[PDB]
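Anyone? Bumping this.
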Amino acid sequence: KWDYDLRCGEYTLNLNEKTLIMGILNVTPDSFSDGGSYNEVDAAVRHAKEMRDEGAHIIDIGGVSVEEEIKRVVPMIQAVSKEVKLPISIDTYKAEVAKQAIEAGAHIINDIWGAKAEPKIAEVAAHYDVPIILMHNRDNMNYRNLMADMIADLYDSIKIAKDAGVRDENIILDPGIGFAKTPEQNLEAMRNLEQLNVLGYPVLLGTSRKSFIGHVLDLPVEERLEGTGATVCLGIEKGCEFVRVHDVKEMSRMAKMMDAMIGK
Amino acid sequence: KWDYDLRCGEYTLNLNEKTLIMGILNVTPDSFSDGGSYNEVDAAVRHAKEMRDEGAHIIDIGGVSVEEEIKRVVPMIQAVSKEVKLPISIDTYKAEVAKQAIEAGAHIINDIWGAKAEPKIAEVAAHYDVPIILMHNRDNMNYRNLMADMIADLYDSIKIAKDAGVRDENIILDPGIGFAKTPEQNLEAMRNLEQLNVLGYPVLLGTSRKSFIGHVLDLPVEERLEGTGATVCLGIEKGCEFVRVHDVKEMSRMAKMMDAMIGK
Ligand SMILES: C[C@H](CC(=O)O)c1nn(C)c2nc(N)[nH]c(=O)c2c1=O
Ligand SMILES: C[C@H](CC(=O)O)c1nn(C)c2nc(N)[nH]c(=O)c2c1=O
């Protein structure tokens, strides 16, 4: 189905064998700290190791202005990439952050604005030859047709990326669940996720603990494991290659079961 | 999609609004007891209430020869139907057990032999006008073609039922996961469950904690919640109307999320 592997510098991700689990790093900052402090970085390394041990395939590390964001995230990327043999994604929409993170050891760019907030981010992705996740996002929830519009917005992102010199194999798409969408539009995007497959790029699904699950189940954020699981299962059945999750152990087990059942 | 409700004497089950959760009753028997003892029945009533409170829609009560089985299950059906306002299914393949259970208060027959072990069970179902679950089962794992064969075997059951005078609306089918199937054939049946929809009967999926999940995940029976969840999610996506589960709270939450996403 995929005739290439996802090339991440030192690491390679096979898109065919299994659903790839992107674990979300707890980056709880220290007050009184610019960044780089021992309790901050150690807590993050500990959590990275923990998720690595629970089945994560990628560690997503994110975030204060630009200068502070770098100082918070660079020392974390330095230590995690040193101590956890796992590809790291830099959760950022900012060109300058993206650059520093990769210089610090990050392998994948995770842009919640799909190269639209800072188009130079794609120049960054192009130059370092790294995979970039282009997430559907917009400043409004005024759709003519949700899916049709989503796909149009994702293409505008793909265009910005390719114009900058990003190779097709370095593009991952993301429906951006819980971004610029009603709880009902999120459900609708879930129900029709498979439509994103026609664009011909791997798809990452980020639904973990999100508000729409809470709207369906009427459960607070810490009571969202079962609902997250359901979204993850449906996402894998509808073809997505990555899931971005908080509960690595559990989702990793669900993904593995889904994979076996669908023949992936 | 369904133009009738599942009629269960005092209770009615809408097959359209949501995935119906059949909770599995712990029927742990007392040693030194024929049946009907206080610790036995109370433990079962307690568990029934517990599952009723966790989102179960049906209580499955099962099981010693024929005479003992009745004496174990009747007093339980008597007390549960008294104290838990929820339809009860009698998990049995035996005609005489089926009869006693309904006389005692059971609403649905759950036959793991699909009327094939004791064809008179269908006469029982016909006479009391109760829903009967016909589960795929056989004494061998020698398939020409799994799905094609399953459907043939399910039809042989439907035929026995209808010949006995069972109405179409009182027939539920079940793929019988983990019965007469390799771990691999179970996966295959999961991957192709939607094929059972053509027979035009509601479908119950019983996968909870089963051996095949353990084969995929290499986890013991108590570590099967995530995998069970995945099978439940896939089952609902492939159209099934009931799930028979041990972990009611959790599965009930997954079902509810699946339901919202698929528009059920
Ligand atoms: C807002 C939320 C916050 C978080 O959990 O850190 C979030 N952040 N990021 C970076 C994301 N990236 C991708 N690719 N897909 C997402 O669905 C997603 C998110 O939902
Ligand atoms: C063997 C197992 C034992 C149990 O959990 O009590 C079992 N019992 N029964 C009564 C079942 N009935 C239906 N309809 N579908 C099933 O998949 C199923 C089962 O897997």
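Late reply, but here is one note on the structure posted above: Residues 1-264 of chain B form a domain with the TIM Barrel fold (CATH 3.20.20.20).
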